Write a protein that holds these residues in place. Structure first.
Motif, PDB file in Angstrom:
ATOM      1  N   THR A  72       0.824  -1.215   0.000  1.00 19.04           N
ATOM      2  CA  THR A  72       0.000   0.000   0.000  1.00 19.04           C
ATOM      3  C   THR A  72       0.863   1.273   0.000  1.00 19.04           C
ATOM      4  O   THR A  72       2.004   1.274   0.458  1.00 19.04           O
ATOM      5  N   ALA A  73       0.292   2.367  -0.507  1.00 25.80           N
ATOM      6  CA  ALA A  73       0.901   3.701  -0.505  1.00 25.80           C
ATOM      7  C   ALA A  73      -0.101   4.804  -0.145  1.00 25.80           C
ATOM      8  O   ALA A  73      -1.261   4.721  -0.551  1.00 25.80           O
ATOM      9  N   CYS A  74       0.353   5.870   0.525  1.00 20.65           N
ATOM     10  CA  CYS A  74      -0.362   7.136   0.567  1.00 20.65           C
ATOM     11  C   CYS A  74       0.022   8.009  -0.633  1.00 20.65           C
ATOM     12  O   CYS A  74       1.179   8.034  -1.076  1.00 20.65           O
ATOM     13  N   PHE A  75      -0.960   8.729  -1.180  1.00 16.48           N
ATOM     14  CA  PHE A  75      -0.694   9.786  -2.147  1.00 16.48           C
ATOM     15  C   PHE A  75      -0.562  11.080  -1.348  1.00 16.48           C
ATOM     16  O   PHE A  75      -1.549  11.591  -0.809  1.00 16.48           O
ATOM     17  N   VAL A  76       0.663  11.595  -1.251  1.00 19.46           N
ATOM     18  CA  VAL A  76       0.980  12.844  -0.556  1.00 19.46           C
ATOM     19  C   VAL A  76       1.139  13.893  -1.649  1.00 19.46           C
ATOM     20  O   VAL A  76       2.122  13.918  -2.377  1.00 19.46           O
ATOM     21  N   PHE A  77       0.196  14.816  -1.755  1.00 21.90           N
ATOM     22  CA  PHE A  77       0.142  15.794  -2.833  1.00 21.90           C
ATOM     23  C   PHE A  77       0.881  17.042  -2.365  1.00 21.90           C
ATOM     24  O   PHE A  77       0.484  17.684  -1.397  1.00 21.90           O
ATOM     25  N   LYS A  78       2.010  17.326  -3.008  1.00 15.80           N
ATOM     26  CA  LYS A  78       2.912  18.435  -2.688  1.00 15.80           C
ATOM     27  C   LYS A  78       2.781  19.509  -3.774  1.00 15.80           C
ATOM     28  O   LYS A  78       3.317  19.390  -4.878  1.00 15.80           O
ATOM     29  N   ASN A  79       2.041  20.569  -3.454  1.00 15.18           N
ATOM     30  CA  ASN A  79       1.863  21.764  -4.274  1.00 15.18           C
ATOM     31  C   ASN A  79       3.082  22.678  -4.118  1.00 15.18           C
ATOM     32  O   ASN A  79       3.512  22.953  -2.998  1.00 15.18           O
ATOM     33  N   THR A  80       3.670  23.109  -5.231  1.00 17.32           N
ATOM     34  CA  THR A  80       4.935  23.817  -5.362  1.00 17.32           C
ATOM     35  C   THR A  80       4.718  24.782  -6.533  1.00 17.32           C
ATOM     36  O   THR A  80       3.740  24.623  -7.262  1.00 17.32           O
ATOM     37  N   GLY A  81       5.603  25.739  -6.781  1.00 19.63           N
ATOM     38  CA  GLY A  81       5.526  26.875  -7.737  1.00 19.63           C
ATOM     39  C   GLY A  81       4.397  26.808  -8.776  1.00 19.63           C
ATOM     40  O   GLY A  81       3.235  27.023  -8.411  1.00 19.63           O
ATOM     41  N   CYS A  82       4.669  26.783 -10.087  1.00 13.05           N
ATOM     42  CA  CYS A  82       3.636  26.121 -10.899  1.00 13.05           C
ATOM     43  C   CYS A  82       3.994  24.646 -11.154  1.00 13.05           C
ATOM     44  O   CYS A  82       4.808  24.308 -12.017  1.00 13.05           O
ATOM     45  N   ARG A  83       3.275  23.761 -10.446  1.00 12.00           N
ATOM     46  CA  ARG A  83       2.802  22.400 -10.752  1.00 12.00           C
ATOM     47  C   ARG A  83       1.986  21.884  -9.550  1.00 12.00           C
ATOM     48  O   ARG A  83       2.424  22.073  -8.413  1.00 12.00           O
ATOM     49  N   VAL A  84       0.936  21.082  -9.717  1.00 17.15           N
ATOM     50  CA  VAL A  84       0.673  20.038  -8.687  1.00 17.15           C
ATOM     51  C   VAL A  84       1.611  18.839  -8.886  1.00 17.15           C
ATOM     52  O   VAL A  84       1.846  18.429 -10.022  1.00 17.15           O
ATOM     53  N   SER A  85       2.108  18.211  -7.815  1.00 14.96           N
ATOM     54  CA  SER A  85       2.536  16.803  -7.870  1.00 14.96           C
ATOM     55  C   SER A  85       1.855  15.937  -6.810  1.00 14.96           C
ATOM     56  O   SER A  85       1.334  16.453  -5.819  1.00 14.96           O
ATOM     57  N   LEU A  86       1.879  14.615  -7.002  1.00 17.53           N
ATOM     58  CA  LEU A  86       1.697  13.650  -5.921  1.00 17.53           C
ATOM     59  C   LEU A  86       3.009  12.900  -5.696  1.00 17.53           C
ATOM     60  O   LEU A  86       3.514  12.190  -6.566  1.00 17.53           O
ATOM     61  N   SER A  87       3.563  13.094  -4.506  1.00 20.19           N
ATOM     62  CA  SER A  87       4.679  12.341  -3.967  1.00 20.19           C
ATOM     63  C   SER A  87       4.136  11.018  -3.417  1.00 20.19           C
ATOM     64  O   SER A  87       3.235  11.001  -2.574  1.00 20.19           O
ATOM     65  N   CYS A  88       4.622   9.890  -3.923  1.00 23.00           N
ATOM     66  CA  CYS A  88       4.077   8.578  -3.600  1.00 23.00           C
ATOM     67  C   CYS A  88       4.994   7.826  -2.634  1.00 23.00           C
ATOM     68  O   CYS A  88       6.094   7.383  -2.982  1.00 23.00           O
ATOM     69  N   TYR A  89       4.482   7.611  -1.424  1.00 25.11           N
ATOM     70  CA  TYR A  89       5.173   6.877  -0.378  1.00 25.11           C
ATOM     71  C   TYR A  89       4.588   5.470  -0.189  1.00 25.11           C
ATOM     72  O   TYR A  89       3.542   5.314   0.437  1.00 25.11           O
ATOM     73  N   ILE A  90       5.338   4.436  -0.597  1.00 26.29           N
ATOM     74  CA  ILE A  90       5.411   3.187   0.192  1.00 26.29           C
ATOM     75  C   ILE A  90       6.343   3.476   1.384  1.00 26.29           C
ATOM     76  O   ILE A  90       7.544   3.209   1.361  1.00 26.29           O
TER      77      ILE A  90
END
Length: 171
Positions: A72-90
């Motif tokens: 399993t993983a959490c989707f950790v969404f890290k908003n930064t300058g211009c972009r959304v990302s999702l940082s994916c942690y197992i």
């Protein structure tokens, strides 16, 4: 071969799904290793980088993620300058103390962090072996902001479900 560990086909499958349901290409999804994920120091996955004015039935992807090898993983969404990302942690994240969760629509800050997982959806609605949670992002520069929405449905999201099969099983 380093401080993240995914098997040769497994990341390629999850990254293939990520470009396919964000409906962008393999050089337009941005991937990143240790520098944003290393707080589990030997294993994790990566990060995935995302566009404005875009929707997906997000829990179809959470389901595919956990089903791929039984982990399993959490989707950790890290908003930064211009972009959304999702940082994916197992994995175990550093800012988990002070980053957020939502089910709503709201304004969201330009340097912010937020977790959405099957345990979080289970806190904020009664979950089911049939959930299609749905998620929508915008960037703005005129407002120096993010505009975030994520909302929880069961099988009632049947129209978007059909439309997604009608893109992704129709490439």
């Amino acid at each position: 071969a380093g401080h993240m560990e995914i098997d040769k086909n497994v990341g390629a499958d999850l990254i293939s799904n990520t470009r396919r349901i964000l409906r962008l290409d393999e050089n337009e999804l941005r991937i990143t290793d240790t520098a944003l994920i290393c707080k589990n120091p030997n294993y994790s996955l990566c990060d995935a980088m995302l566009t404005t004015d875009i929707v997906y039935p997000v829990e179809y992807l959470l389901s595919y993620w956990e089903c791929r090898s039984g982990r399993t993983a959490c989707f950790v969404f890290k908003n930064t300058g211009c972009r959304v990302s999702l940082s994916c942690y197992i994995g175990f994240p550093e800012r988990l103390k002070d980053l957020k969760r939502v089910c709503d629509f709201n304004f969201l800050s330009v340097n912010e962090a937020l977790v959405v997982t099957l345990a979080d959806i289970e806190r904020i609605k009664p979950c089911d072996k049939g959930v299609l949670t749905n998620c929508v992002v915008r960037k703005s520069n005129s407002g120096m902001s993010y505009n975030i929405e994520v909302v929880a449905f069961g099988p009632d999201n049947e129209a978007e479900y059909q439309a997604l099969l009608r893109d992704i099983y129709a490439r």
